[PDB]
């Protein structure tokens, strides 16, 4: 869902911490999407997320 | 490193139930990667695997 302005990924390594996800985690989520930080995202969502409930 | 044919996946969602990786974790690493096997192995390898150890 369109983040507007764009220039780095730093800022959203910090709101993924915000959430749980430790900067280790954080980082391989990045590395195995190829940077892609809106893949990675889904990645940490599902796994490193709640999957149940 | 090639697998060297192509024509199926499962064959590869086969190996990962071996490695302990649940029907579930294989599937949701699948479509998060855009259904590329090696991108979804690499998930669990990274986060499904041991972190420590």
Redesign the interface.
């Known amino acids: 869902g369109s983040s507007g302005s764009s220039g780095q990924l730093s800022s959203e390594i910090e709101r993924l911490m915000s959430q749980g996800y430790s900067y280790?985690?954080i980082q391989?989520?990045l590395?195995?999407?190829?940077n892609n930080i809106e893949?990675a995202k889904?990645?940490l969502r599902?796994?490193?997320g709640p999957?149940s409930g």
């Open positions: 280790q985690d391989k989520a590395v195995i999407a190829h893949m889904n990645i599902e796994f490193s999957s």
